[PDB]
Design a protein around this ligand. Structure first.
Ligand code: MCM
Ligand code: ZN
Length: 267
């Protein structure tokens, strides 16, 4: 795979429709905890233990504690130079009639905070709720999301369950509903929104340049998206930290934190 920034920049100058697939490394560069890899725990659990329908069914208080913590932590977090380069790229290109879309697996909204408008959040958002009775999706930035969760969700091992009664967990405020809310995020074992995937397929079909940032391209989610772009002859450029491996039938690979390489690539 080429690591020629100048060659990349020649494609970038001429590209009219860029798809940017954003993975977990973009969030990790802002210090956002993911509770996934080695060492990444909340109390005695990882995300694969708590971000499941079964976990929520059996202990909705514990799952709400986990997502309440993740909401509140964001008050100490900021977009990084990678987020900023991506947003500035969209803004500048949009005034030229050129399209930039960000397809992200990240749920912490830092792309939005940085100014990205054309955003597909394929795993949902920490700052949206979904009613488990009526299905309504709502924005929710309230600190705390409900009074019973104030001071709850502490991450330290040994912290006891809050065991909030389900009636005091976040509830739907649509007139005549009152159901129990869940976080509007995709759980392990769940389907991605087909309408989201409808929009993703349209962007992949039409783009003339594809970036994979903060993730590997040979793994989910980018492995679902990049192959068919590359198969069309569209250049695929990967920006990530792991020394290729990932092995790439793709055009470019730039090693390093994306906050180091993207400001230059997307200038
Ligand atoms: N079921 C499942 C859920 C989530 C995954 C992520 C976030 C990454 C992955 O590589 O494979 C997953 C599989
Ligand atoms: Zn409802």
């Amino acid at each position: 795979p080429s690591s020629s920034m100048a060659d990349f920049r020649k494609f970038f100058a001429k590209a009219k429709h860029i798809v940017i697939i954003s993975g977990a490394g973009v969030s990790a560069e802002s210090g956002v905890p993911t509770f996934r890899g080695a060492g990444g725990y909340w109390r005695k659990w990882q995300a694969q233990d708590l971000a499941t329908p079964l976990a929520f069914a059996h202990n909705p208080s514990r799952v709400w504690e986990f997502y309440h913590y993740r909401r509140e932590v964001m008050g100490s977090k900021e977009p990084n130079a990678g987020h900023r380069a991506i947003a500035e790229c969209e803004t500048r290109l949009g005034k030229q009639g050129r399209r930039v879309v960000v397809i992200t697996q990240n749920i912490d909204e830092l792309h939005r905070k940085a100014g990205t408008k054309n955003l597909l959040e394929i795993h949902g958002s920490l700052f949206k709720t979904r009613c488990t009775s009526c299905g309504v999706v709502a924005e929710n930035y309230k600190s705390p999301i409900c009074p019973a969760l104030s001071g709850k969700g502490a991450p330290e091992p040994g912290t006891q369950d809050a065991s909030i009664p389900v009636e005091k967990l976040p509830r739907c405020e649509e007139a005549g509903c009152g159901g129990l809310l869940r976080p509007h995020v995709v759980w392990f074992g769940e389907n991605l929104d087909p309408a989201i995937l409808e929009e993703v397929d349209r962007e992949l079909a039409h783009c003339d340049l594809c970036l994979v940032v903060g993730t590997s391209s040979v793994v989910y989610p980018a492995a679902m998206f990049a192959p068919q772009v590359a198969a069309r002859g569209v250049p695929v450029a990967e920006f990530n930290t792991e020394t290729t491996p990932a092995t790439n039938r793709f055009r470019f690979h730039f090693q390093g934190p994306c906050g180091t390489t993207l400001p230059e690539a997307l200038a």
